[PDB]
Scaffold this active site. Sequence first.
Site, PDB file in Angstrom:
ATOM      1  N   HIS A  68     -31.176  53.842 -23.407  1.00 37.27           N
ATOM      2  CA  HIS A  68     -31.177  53.182 -24.740  1.00 37.27           C
ATOM      3  C   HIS A  68     -29.964  53.640 -25.564  1.00 37.27           C
ATOM      4  O   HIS A  68     -30.127  54.115 -26.709  1.00 37.27           O
ATOM      5  CB  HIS A  68     -32.517  53.364 -25.445  1.00 37.27           C
ATOM      6  CG  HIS A  68     -33.610  52.601 -24.787  1.00 37.27           C
ATOM      7  ND1 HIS A  68     -34.547  53.214 -23.989  1.00 37.27           N
ATOM      8  CD2 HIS A  68     -33.892  51.281 -24.761  1.00 37.27           C
ATOM      9  CE1 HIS A  68     -35.373  52.294 -23.512  1.00 37.27           C
ATOM     10  NE2 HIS A  68     -35.001  51.112 -23.985  1.00 37.27           N
ATOM     11  N   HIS A  72     -26.058  49.843 -23.513  1.00 34.84           N
ATOM     12  CA  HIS A  72     -27.203  48.893 -23.480  1.00 34.84           C
ATOM     13  C   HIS A  72     -27.048  47.856 -24.601  1.00 34.84           C
ATOM     14  O   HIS A  72     -27.243  46.648 -24.340  1.00 34.84           O
ATOM     15  CB  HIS A  72     -28.524  49.650 -23.557  1.00 34.84           C
ATOM     16  CG  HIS A  72     -29.698  48.760 -23.771  1.00 34.84           C
ATOM     17  ND1 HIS A  72     -30.192  47.951 -22.778  1.00 34.84           N
ATOM     18  CD2 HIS A  72     -30.465  48.544 -24.860  1.00 34.84           C
ATOM     19  CE1 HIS A  72     -31.239  47.287 -23.246  1.00 34.84           C
ATOM     20  NE2 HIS A  72     -31.418  47.622 -24.518  1.00 34.84           N
ATOM     21  N   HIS A 106     -30.274  46.206 -31.870  1.00 39.67           N
ATOM     22  CA  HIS A 106     -31.727  46.063 -31.606  1.00 39.67           C
ATOM     23  C   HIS A 106     -32.350  47.416 -31.239  1.00 39.67           C
ATOM     24  O   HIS A 106     -33.557  47.493 -31.368  1.00 39.67           O
ATOM     25  CB  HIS A 106     -32.010  44.980 -30.553  1.00 39.67           C
ATOM     26  CG  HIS A 106     -31.847  45.454 -29.147  1.00 39.67           C
ATOM     27  ND1 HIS A 106     -30.618  45.567 -28.538  1.00 39.67           N
ATOM     28  CD2 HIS A 106     -32.753  45.861 -28.236  1.00 39.67           C
ATOM     29  CE1 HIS A 106     -30.776  46.029 -27.313  1.00 39.67           C
ATOM     30  NE2 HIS A 106     -32.073  46.240 -27.102  1.00 39.67           N
ATOM     31  N   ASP A 107     -31.588  48.412 -30.775  1.00 42.63           N
ATOM     32  CA  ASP A 107     -32.128  49.739 -30.359  1.00 42.63           C
ATOM     33  C   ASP A 107     -31.423  50.871 -31.132  1.00 42.63           C
ATOM     34  O   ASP A 107     -31.460  52.029 -30.657  1.00 42.63           O
ATOM     35  CB  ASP A 107     -31.993  49.965 -28.850  1.00 42.63           C
ATOM     36  CG  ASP A 107     -33.079  49.385 -27.943  1.00 42.63           C
ATOM     37  OD1 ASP A 107     -34.252  49.369 -28.333  1.00 42.63           O
ATOM     38  OD2 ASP A 107     -32.730  48.980 -26.810  1.00 42.63           O
ATOM     39  N   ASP A 217     -32.765  41.572 -23.452  1.00 46.49           N
ATOM     40  CA  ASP A 217     -33.202  42.987 -23.407  1.00 46.49           C
ATOM     41  C   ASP A 217     -33.471  43.418 -21.963  1.00 46.49           C
ATOM     42  O   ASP A 217     -33.191  44.605 -21.640  1.00 46.49           O
ATOM     43  CB  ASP A 217     -34.425  43.234 -24.285  1.00 46.49           C
ATOM     44  CG  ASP A 217     -34.515  44.665 -24.785  1.00 46.49           C
ATOM     45  OD1 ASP A 217     -33.490  45.374 -24.722  1.00 46.49           O
ATOM     46  OD2 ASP A 217     -35.594  45.039 -25.299  1.00 46.49           O
ATOM     47  N   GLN A 269     -41.708  48.169  -9.405  1.00 47.21           N
ATOM     48  CA  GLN A 269     -40.673  47.143  -9.722  1.00 47.21           C
ATOM     49  C   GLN A 269     -41.218  45.745  -9.385  1.00 47.21           C
ATOM     50  O   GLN A 269     -41.032  44.836 -10.227  1.00 47.21           O
ATOM     51  CB  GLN A 269     -39.354  47.450  -9.019  1.00 47.21           C
ATOM     52  CG  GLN A 269     -38.634  48.674  -9.577  1.00 47.21           C
ATOM     53  CD  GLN A 269     -37.918  48.381 -10.873  1.00 47.21           C
ATOM     54  OE1 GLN A 269     -37.247  47.367 -11.028  1.00 47.21           O
ATOM     55  NE2 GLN A 269     -38.069  49.268 -11.836  1.00 47.21           N
TER      56      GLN A 269
END
EC number: 3.1.4.17
Length: 313
Positions: A68, A72, A106-107, A217, A269
Site C-alpha cells: 500500500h 500502488h 485512494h490509500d 484497485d 488465489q
Amino acid sequence: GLMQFTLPVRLCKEIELFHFDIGPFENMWPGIFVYMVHRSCGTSCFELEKLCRFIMSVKKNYRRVPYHNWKHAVTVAHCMYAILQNNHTLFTDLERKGLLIACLCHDLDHRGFSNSYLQKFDHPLAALYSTSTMEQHHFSQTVSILQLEGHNIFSTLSSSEYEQVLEIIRKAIIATDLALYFGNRKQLEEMYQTGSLNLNNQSHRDRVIGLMMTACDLCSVTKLWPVTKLTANDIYAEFWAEGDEMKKLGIQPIPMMDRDKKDEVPQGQLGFYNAVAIPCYTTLTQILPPTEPLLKACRDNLSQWEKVIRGEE
Ligand SMILES: COc1c(C)cnc(CSc2nc3ccc4ncsc4c3[nH]2)c1C
Ligand SMILES: [Mg+2]
Ligand SMILES: [Zn+2]
C-alpha cells in the site's frame, strides 16, 4: 502552457495498454501521472505548478510498506487512465479530473493494516470512523493536502463544480473498501440484467464509478503473469505482518494472513479470482465493453494459478 510531458517510445505505446507496468524507476512515476492527466483531461485541467506540488505532497504522505505504497497509487491511477481513454464519450470533464486524483489519493497514509486489525487493536481511527475506517482516513488526508497553500489544483472550478468533484473523489475512495464491493456489484448485476441500468441516473453512475475503483484497485490480477506473481509477494508480505500482530494480541489470524499457511496461497488465489476478481471485471465488461482486455488478462492469470496447484509451476 506549451510544455507537454513526453515518454520514451516503448512507454508512449505501452502506457495506453491495460497491462502496462510503471517500472522500477520511482523518479519517473510523477511524469507518467502528469502525462496521463494531460492526455485524459487536457494540458489546461490543472496549473502545472500546483499539480506538481500536489503530486509531491501526496507521494510524501504514502509510507514505506510492502504493497500500500506510492507505486500502488500510480499503478491504480494508470488502470483508471486506460479505462477513461477506452471510454472517451461516457465521462464528464469533472469525472475525468476527479477520478485520476481519487486513484492517486485512494490509500493515502496507509499503515499496511486492514480495518479489522485497527478495530481489534482499538486504534484511535477506529473510534473516529466505525466503518470503512482507513478509506475515510484516505479521503481526510486528500482534503488536508488540497488545503495546503499552493496545493489546491481545483481552485479554477466554480463553487458548485468544486463541491461536485470533492463528492466524486469521496465516493470513489469510500468504494475502494472491499467490504462494500460485493453488494455494489450484485446491485449493478441485477440492474444490467433486468435492463434498469441508466447512466443518466446519478445513483447508477456512482455505482458504476464504485466498480471502476474496485477494478483499478485489484488491477494486479490483470497484468502479465510475472508482474501478477511478484506483486502477490508484496501483498502477502503486508498480510503476514498483520497476522504476526494478530498473534501478538492473542488472536489466531485468518489463513490469508498466517505465514504458517504459505502452502495454501495457490488455493486462496483461486477462491479470490472466482469470488472477487472474475465477477468484478465481468460486470465491468458488461457495462463498459472496451474494458474486456482486463477480464481476458484476469482469466489468463486464473489459469496460471490453476497450473501452480497442478505442480506444473
Ligand atoms: C488486494 O487484493 C488481493 C489481491 C490483488 C491478490 N491476492 C489477494 C489475496 S487472496 C487470498 N484469499 C485466501 C484465503 C486463504 C488463504 N490461505 C493462505 S493464503 C490465502 C488467501 N489469499 C488479495 C486480497
Ligand atoms: Mg485501500
Ligand atoms: Zn488500494
